[PDB]
Each structure stands twice: as C-alpha cells, then as structure tokens.
Design a protein around this ligand. Structure first.
Ligand SMILES: C=CC(C)(C)OC[C@H]1O[C@H](O[C@@H]2C3=C([C@H](C)COC(C)=O)C[C@H](O)[C@]3(C)/C=C3/[C@@H](COC)CC[C@H]3[C@@H](C)[C@H]2O)[C@H](O)[C@@H](OC(C)=O)[C@@H]1O
Ligand SMILES: C=CC(C)(C)OC[C@H]1O[C@H](O[C@@H]2C3=C([C@H](C)COC(C)=O)C[C@H](O)[C@]3(C)/C=C3/[C@@H](COC)CC[C@H]3[C@@H](C)[C@H]2O)[C@H](O)[C@@H](OC(C)=O)[C@@H]1O
Ligand SMILES: [Cl-]
Ligand SMILES: [Cl-]
Ligand SMILES: [Cl-]
Ligand SMILES: [Cl-]
Ligand SMILES: [Mg+2]
Ligand SMILES: [Mg+2]
Ligand SMILES: [Mg+2]
Ligand SMILES: [Mg+2]
Ligand SMILES: [Mg+2]
Ligand SMILES: [Mg+2]
Ligand SMILES: [Mg+2]
Ligand SMILES: [Mg+2]
Lengths: 5, 234, 234, 5
C-alpha cells in the first residue's frame, strides 16, 4: 500500500 | 444550504465536536456550510475541512477496493449475476459525488481567493488529491483528462511551494508525498515517484537544523511516510 | 420501500458484499428490504440483520457517549452556548430513529411469525437490545417504561431459552450476557447481573463435554465475555 | 466498559 497524507 | 441558518462560529464548533466523536460525515457537512458563508478559512479551519473529507472518501475508497477485487475475481473458472457490479457502481457513484462536492468548493471560491502561499498550496493539494481519487476509479474516455487535472493541480502547488516555503514546511512535504504517489500508481511513472520522494526527504533532512524542538511533529511524520514509500518502492 | 424493486436473493447477496466491505449502513438497508419481502429469515440471514444494525447503532452510541461527556463537563468552573446540546441531540435523535426502525421490523412481523425457539429468542434478544439502547439515552417520563420494555423482552427470551435450548447454545449465552449488562448498568441491579453471569457461565462449562470440537467457537467467545464482565464486576 | 454481543 502507498502512503498518503 | 441545509447549514445556511447556522452561525459560522457554531459550524466550526460543531465540526470540532464531530472530529472528537469521529463523525466525519457530519464534520464534512459542517465545514461545507462554513465555507459557503463566503469568508476565507483560517489555518486551523482548513485542517478541519481536509480531515473531514479525507476520512469520508477514505472509507469509500477502501470499500470500493474491496468490491472491485471481488468483481475482478468474478470475471476470471468463476461462476456468473449483476449484483457485484451494481453495488460496486453504487459505492463508486457515491464516491464520485463526494469528490465532485469537494472540487466544487475549491472552485467556489477557496482557491481563487487564497493569496498566502500556505493556503494556496493547501487547496491545490486538495484539488489534486480529489482528482486523483476520481482517477483511481476512472475507466472511460475521461481517465486521461482526469489524470491531467490532478497533475496540473499538483504541479502548480509544487511550483508555489518550492518558491514560497521552506523544505520542511508540512504542507510542502505533504504535497510532495501525494504527488509522488500520483506518479507511482496513477501516472505509471515509478522512477519520477522515487526521484521526487528522495529529493523531498533529503532537502528536508538538511533543513532540520533550523527548526525549534517539538514544533515540527507533523513534518517528521510526513518525512517518515516518504521513507516508508521509498523502502516499499526500492 | 427503496428496496422494493430488488429481488430478495439480490438483497441478501448485497448484504454479504456490504459486510465484507464494512459498509454497515448499506448492509442494514439491504436486510431491511429483505425482511420487508414478507418471508421469514434463515439462521444465516438473521445474523446478517443483527450484525448490520449492531454496527450502525454501535457507532452512534460511541459518538453519543463522547458528546454527552463533553456536555457533562460543560455543565460543571466551566464557561458557557447551545451547540454541544444541539449536536448531542442530533446524534441522539438519529440513534433513536435507528432503534425505532429495528423495533418496527421485529414487530412487523419477525417476532410473531417465529415458531422455532432459536429464531424466537434471537428476535426477542434484539428487541431487548434496542430498547436498552433507547434507555441509555432516555431522561424523561419514558425512561421507566422503556426500561421495562427491555426487561419484558429479555425475560420472555430467557424463559424460552431455558426451556428449549442447551446451556451452551450461542444464542442462549448471548441473551444471558446482554440481559446481565442490562441489570448492571440500566436496571441498577449489579447483584442480579453478577448472579446471572456466573450461573450462565457455570452451567455452560458443565455442558461443554457434550460438544464436538471446533463447532462452538461462538459459544466459547461469549463465555469469555461473561468471564471478563465478572472480573470487572467483582 | 461492559461487554455485550
Ligand atoms: C483534525 C484536526 C486536528 C486533529 C486538530 O489537527 C490535525 C493536525 O493538523 C496539523 O497537521 C496537518 C495535518 C496532518 C499532520 C501530518 C499530522 O501530524 C501529526 C503529529 O499527527 C494530518 C492531517 O490530515 C493534516 C490536517 C493534513 C495536511 C495535509 C493537508 O493537505 C491538504 C498536508 C500536510 C498536512 C499539514 C496541513 C499538517 O500541518 C497539526 O500540525 C497537527 O498537530 C501536530 C502536533 O502536528 C494536527 O494533528
Ligand atoms: C456477519 C455474519 C458472519 C461474519 C458471516 O457471521 C457472524 C457470526 O455468526 C455466528 O455467530 C453468531 C454471532 C456472533 C459470535 C459470538 C461470533 O463468534 C465468533 C467466533 O466470532 C457475533 C455476531 O454478532 C452474531 C451474529 C451475533 C449473535 C447474537 C445475536 O443476538 C441477536 C447472539 C449470540 C450470537 C450468535 C447468533 C452467534 O451464533 C457464527 O456462528 C459465527 O461463526 C463462528 C466461527 O462462530 C460468525 O462469526
Ligand atoms: Cl489531506
Ligand atoms: Cl446496489
Ligand atoms: Cl446540530
Ligand atoms: Cl447482536
Ligand atoms: Mg490514505
Ligand atoms: Mg452570522
Ligand atoms: Mg461508474
Ligand atoms: Mg484572500
Ligand atoms: Mg421475487
Ligand atoms: Mg432527545
Ligand atoms: Mg413461522
Ligand atoms: Mg458493543
């Protein structure tokens, strides 16, 4: 999973 | 405007109450009403807006992904009806509706009235985020155009943040993190994603010496997300 | 009936999809439509119904508790407006609406058409649960009557389950667990709550020797909840 | 907190 904010 | 009869200050107060109660659909509706009062949002009020819709759309996206995975399996030795597609479309349309609502708020009139760099980049990040969420589910003739609307929003924010903000600013870092995720999984550009995450991380590292202690907790958190994506990507 | 045009089988299928996606509001709406088709629910379909509304009302209750705590603090050296009460009332009214909807389904016509003990006790447990949730927020002239509606529903279920079911039946155990929580925090009867939890646990323990391996996982889970309440209560 | 099912 790719982490975003 | 269901919130048109409520005072702006009361809407902000109730958005904070909803946040404490993790009632994010309510929180988003209160902040939508607050935006529609026509006054610009403060730094703290912008954060209430983004957190609310981030959590609403976040749950919709996770549910869409569960259903799309079930749908993909159903189209492989798999037995046949239309129900999975129908319910996936239901969640998808509800997701697109929330993204359309956020984008409309940014367009009317948060982005055009934002003069300070911090607010302008903040809202342009949001615009890129919610066009990205639309791109995640897009499959028709619009996918390419939706992707470029995200790129264009992210890119203008990048240009402003590199001109007007220090490398460790949390908004500049958060924009860079999400623009790199855009490159990696939307725009089919993993090398660009990796280059951006590393230059972003490295230039913030070299600028930490300027910051006071315990006043960049959010910047630290985002630098860790960049390091985590890089570990996953390399 | 927004679900009136959808096949019963499709509603059940979509309720299971919603469960996998943790879309519990959707799950409850699908199962409401399924009940309104007029046919009795199967064992598996009853579980879909209870899980859906349990999760919907569960989130409403947790949010109501957060707001009621903030409200209580505001009425102690605390500064004064009406917003906290207003938003607490908003969540409360939405919670009462869901409880009213569930109780109406049970009354029309799940309880009256249920002949087998397992289904009858199941639905009477639900009726006690959702009257209990109404009692948690009740403060007016209706509190006493709401409390007795819960007691009466729980008690009939208890009488049936002790006559028709073995001590380790998961529905009988779950009913006893919730009736004991009713005694402890609604009916101001902690000694009755403790006596019931212990007799319930002890009589299931002595009956485990009759059960096949790996076929009472749910009964084991509930026996652990009884042991946890007892540890907290004594 | 009291546990229910
Ligand atoms: C919901 C509002 C509350 C909980 C009051 O605040 C959320 C947070 O709001 C601020 O943090 C912002 C912020 C986040 C920080 C990374 C959180 O940091 C910590 C220590 O938890 C996450 C939030 O979603 C938020 C508002 C989002 C943005 C993001 C918005 O894009 C449009 C860009 C990067 C990031 C910026 C705006 C952060 O400054 C604050 O600096 C945080 O406080 C600390 C100690 O860092 C606070 O947790
Ligand atoms: C949502 C439906 C799914 C996930 C498919 O099933 C939920 C569960 O449905 C069954 O369990 C029921 C059941 C629960 C079990 C205690 C869960 O057990 C385990 C191992 O997780 C929790 C659920 O909420 C449910 C349906 C609720 C009732 C409760 C209803 O009152 C009106 C009374 C006690 C309990 C009974 C009905 C349990 O039999 C099954 O026996 C469980 O399977 C196992 C291995 O025990 C399954 O997890
Ligand atoms: Cl954000
Ligand atoms: Cl659907
Ligand atoms: Cl309100
Ligand atoms: Cl239950
Ligand atoms: Mg996310
Ligand atoms: Mg005013
Ligand atoms: Mg579609
Ligand atoms: Mg301005
Ligand atoms: Mg039919
Ligand atoms: Mg009320
Ligand atoms: Mg019958
Ligand atoms: Mg509970």
């Amino acid at each position: 999973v790719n982490l975003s904010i | 405007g269901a919130m048109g009869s409520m005072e702006r200050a009361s809407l902000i107060q109730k958005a904070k109450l909803a946040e404490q109660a993790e009632r994010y659909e309510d929180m988003a509706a209160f902040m939508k009403g607050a935006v529609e009062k026509g006054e610009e949002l403060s730094c703290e009020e912008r954060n209430l807006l983004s957190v609310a819709y981030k959590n609403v759309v976040g749950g919709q996206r996770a549910a869409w992904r569960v259903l799309s995975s079930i749908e993909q399996k159903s189209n492989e030795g798999s037995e046949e009806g239309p129900e999975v597609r129908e319910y996936r479309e239901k969640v998808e349309t509800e997701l697109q509706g929330v993204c359309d609502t956020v984008l409309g708020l940014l367009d009317s009139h948060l982005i055009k009235e934002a003069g300070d760099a911090e607010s302008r980049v903040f809202y342009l990040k949001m615009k890129g985020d919610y066009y990205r969420y639309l791109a995640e589910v897009a499959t028709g003739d619009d996918k390419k155009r939706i992707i470029d609307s995200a790129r264009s929003a992210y890119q203008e924010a990048m240009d402003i943040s590199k001109k007007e903000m220090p490398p460790t600013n949390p908004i500049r870092l958060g924009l860079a993190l999400n623009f790199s995720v855009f490159h990696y999984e939307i725009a089919n550009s993993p090398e660009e994603a990796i280059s951006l995450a590393k230059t972003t991380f490295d230039e913030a590292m070299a600028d930490l010496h300027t910051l006071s202690e315990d006043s960049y907790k959010d910047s630290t958190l985002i630098m860790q997300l960049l390091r985590d994506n890089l570990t996953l990507w390399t």
